[PDB]
């Protein structure tokens, strides 16, 4: 998360961390953000899994403020299985969405608390007013060049760019589809100018906006020409285009 | 066919490698072999049979000359954006009596000629030579210190030079180039500039027979025609000349075989290397003693009038790694793009590299990067 400020997981209780076990060494390294939408499921980005780990390599961590300190009330899961979208494009990042099912015994995996809770999926008839402000969360880098990822969860605030401003014209010649969604910081740039944006390691995390007074998942962090540039928005997966899919991939 | 020449030239590289301690070497295994094969025609009896031994073929045998020609053909170059530049040149005395029917036969195989200068008048044997190179290497190589040793009794002298610059299939954004602590072999540490890019790269992990692991990694040049292969050891105490002296043309092919295309954050140091080599010892290490000896050198196929020996033989190479030519972010290239956290791959240890002509597997360049 470029710009914004550090956070508490309790302010973003659907944020999850995804870890992948190393390949020579013992132990996991931080991979991606994730979003708890049902007790036993989490959304994330497809491209997090381009390197197709078997599930057992993956661990999900709900309810944790620091990316590497265990949280006291956190909830840690072995992945049972994961479903990358069949038509995820690994070059345009079209259809960038995945589904991780949490491995548990009892059809009841994570459970609600002051730090772990599911975020509402948007209604299909959702069209939000342009430049609506939304938030986002991540353990990712603070700036594109930072050696390390965040030591702690951050939050950010951005505004949904209108369609006309989400073509590749405004993204340095890069394919943008009806499945993608750009939000960004529409304040004046400097520098200094700490424009709120997500960064390396935030992909898979949520972009949550108010609607009906109800925090509702609108996008999934995906790509950008990051992080935090010259009125160059951050691109997201339009979650509404995938409501049937999501349904149809929980059976 | 072309693996033979490359592998020979690798052997040539090994010899210099072991002599050059922990120092920056760069070298052309093609370059060396493309002139030795030439000089092969111009030799006799055991002097020849010496260099054919080392190389493993007779340029004289069928199809063998055509091959090299046709290789050279490709290198220059409709796709080669003034990126490479070769030259191979042998010089001899102006007024001399060469055998009848040779210098034409020689043109026939190589299509070049053997260059005739006046060594007696030394001042502009030197120029002439340093400006043969100058012309054919697009000025990127001009001087050549080793020509100092040219005197008037100096009568037969051999030169090879190449200047290579990148032009990546996927260039690094200039924006993202930062200074970074490289660690040298001894222990020390230098703040070198290192370009970074988070893309998808062909990688594989290789181990030598002796439990030494390296990260092998392929960074292709535009159209995938040339690739550079970087090869750096896991932990820093591992000697390069552990790999370097089992390096081979079908070793490289072995790497591309095991490669899978994986998303990684690559961090890699810019560098610019220029090595001039005196080939005598290296070539003599391989058992090529006759050519440099006044009494024993057999050059009768071109000679007739005697003696005639190689006083001097040299290679001057220059490779440049950055992102192609001033170009820089079009902006096409950019630092992160898609926002997952990926496995880093950092190159802060000394390593080595190879540049390749993927269609033919011909090994064009080589080197140890001990320090930028």
From Swiss-Prot, chain A:
Disulphide bonds in the chain: 32-48, 40-109, 134-209, 166-182, 199-227
Important for single-chain activity (site feature) positions: 154, 202
Domain Peptidase S1: 1-251
Protein name in UniProt: Tissue-type plasminogen activator chain B
Glycosylation sites: 173
Active site: 47, 96, 203
Native species: Homo sapiens
Curated annotation (Swiss-Prot), chain B:
Expressing tissues: Expressed in endothelial cells. Found in plasma, platelets, and hepatoma and fibrosarcoma cells.
SMART domains linked to this entry: SERPIN (SM00093)
GO cellular component: collagen-containing extracellular matrix; extracellular exosome; extracellular region; extracellular space; peptidase inhibitor complex; plasma membrane; platelet alpha granule lumen; serine protease inhibitor complex
Induction / repression: Up-regulated by coagulation factor Xa (F10) in atrial tissues. Up-regulated in atrial tissues by rapid pacing resembling atrial fibrillation.
Modification after translation (UniProt): Inactivated by proteolytic attack of the urokinase-type (u-PA) and the tissue-type (TPA), cleaving the 369-Arg-|-Met-370 bond.
GO MF term list: protease binding; serine-type endopeptidase inhibitor activity; signaling receptor binding
Principal location class: secreted
Illness the protein is tied to: Plasminogen activator inhibitor-1 deficiency: A hematologic disorder characterized by increased bleeding after trauma, injury, or surgery. Affected females have menorrhagia. The bleeding defect is due to increased fibrinolysis of fibrin blood clots due to deficiency of plasminogen activator inhibitor-1, which inhibits tissue and urinary activators of plasminogen.
Name the UniProt record assigns to this protein: Plasminogen activator inhibitor 1
Organism: Homo sapiens
Lineage per the UniProt record: Eukaryota, Metazoa, Chordata, Craniata, Vertebrata
Gene giving rise to this polypeptide: SERPINE1
């Amino acid at each position: 998360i470029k710009g914004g400020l550090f956070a508490d997981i309790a302010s973003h209780p659907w944020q999850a961390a995804i870890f992948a076990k190393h390949r020579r060494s013992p132990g996991e390294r931080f991979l991606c953000g994730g979003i708890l939408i049902s007790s036993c499921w989490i959304l994330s980005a497809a491209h997090c899994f381009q390197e197709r780990f078997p599930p057992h390599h993956l661990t999900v961590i709900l309810g944790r403020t620091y990316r590497v300190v265990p949280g006291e009330e956190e909830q840690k899961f072995e992945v049972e299985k994961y479903i990358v979208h069949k038509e995820f494009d690994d070059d345009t990042y079209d259809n960038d969405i995945a589904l991780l099912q949490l491995k548990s015994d009892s059809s009841r995996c994570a459970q609600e608390s002051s730090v772990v809770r599911t975020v509402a999926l948007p209604p299909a008839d959702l069209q939000l007013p342009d430049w609506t402000e939304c938030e986002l969360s991540g353990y990712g880098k603070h700036e594109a060049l930072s050696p390390f990822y965040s030591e702690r969860l951050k939050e950010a605030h951005v505004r949904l760019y209108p369609s006309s401003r989400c073509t590749s014209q405004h993204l340095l010649q890069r394919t943008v589809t009806d499945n993608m969604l750009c939000a960004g910081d529409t304040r004046s740039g400097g520098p200094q100018a700490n424009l709120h944006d997500a960064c390396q390691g935030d992909a898979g995390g949520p972009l949550v906006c108010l609607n009906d007074g109800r925090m509702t998942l609108v996008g999934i962090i995906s790509w950008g020409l990051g992080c935090g540039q010259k009125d160059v928005p951050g691109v997201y997966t339009k979650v509404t285009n995938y409501l049937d899919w999501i349904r149809d991939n929980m059976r | 066919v072309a693996h033979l020449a490359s592998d020979f030239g690798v052997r040539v590289f090994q010899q210099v490698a072991q002599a050059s301690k922990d120092r920056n070497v760069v070298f052309s295994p093609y370059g060396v072999a493309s002139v030795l094969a030439m000089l092969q025609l111009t030799t006799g009896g055991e002097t020849q049979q010496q260099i054919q031994a080392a190389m493993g073929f007779k340029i004289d045998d069928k199809g063998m000359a055509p091959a090299l020609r046709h290789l050279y053909k490709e290198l220059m170059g409709p796709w080669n954006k003034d990126e490479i530049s070769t030259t191979d040149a042998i010089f001899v005395q102006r007024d001399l009596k060469l055998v009848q029917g040779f210098m034409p036969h020689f043109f026939r195989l190589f299509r070049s000629t053997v260059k005739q200068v006046d060594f007696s008048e030394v001042e502009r044997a030197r120029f002439i030579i340093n400006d043969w190179v100058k012309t054919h290497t697009k000025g990127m190589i001009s001087h050549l210190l080793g020509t100092g040793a040219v005197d008037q009794l100096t009568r037969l002298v051999l030169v090879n030079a190449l200047y290579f610059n990148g032009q990546w299939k996927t260039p690094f954004p200039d924006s993202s180039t930062h200074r970074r602590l490289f660690h040298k072999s001894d222990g020390s540490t230098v703040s070198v500039p290192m370009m970074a890019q988070t893309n998808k790269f062909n990688y594989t992990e290789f181990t030598t027979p002796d439990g030494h692991y390296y990260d092998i990694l392929e960074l292709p040049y535009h159209g995938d025609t040339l690739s550079m292969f970087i090869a750096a050891p896991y932990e820093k105490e591992v000697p390069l000349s552990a790999l370097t002296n089992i390096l081979s043309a079908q070793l490289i092919s072995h790497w591309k075989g095991n490669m899978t295309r994986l998303p990684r954050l690559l961090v890699l140091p810019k560098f610019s290397l220029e090595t001039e080599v005196d080939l005598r010892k290296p070539l003599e290490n391989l058992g090529m003693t006759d050519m440099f000896r006044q009494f024993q050198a057999d050059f009768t196929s071109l000679s007739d009038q005697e003696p005639l020996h190689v006083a001097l033989a040299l290679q001057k190479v220059k490779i440049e790694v950055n992102e192609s030519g001033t170009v820089a972010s079009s902006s096409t290239a950019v630092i992160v793009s898609a926002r997952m956290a990926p496995e880093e791959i950092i190159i802060d240890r000394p390593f080595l590299f190879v540049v390749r002509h993927n269609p033919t597997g011909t090994v064009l360049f080589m080197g140890q990067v001990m320090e930028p």
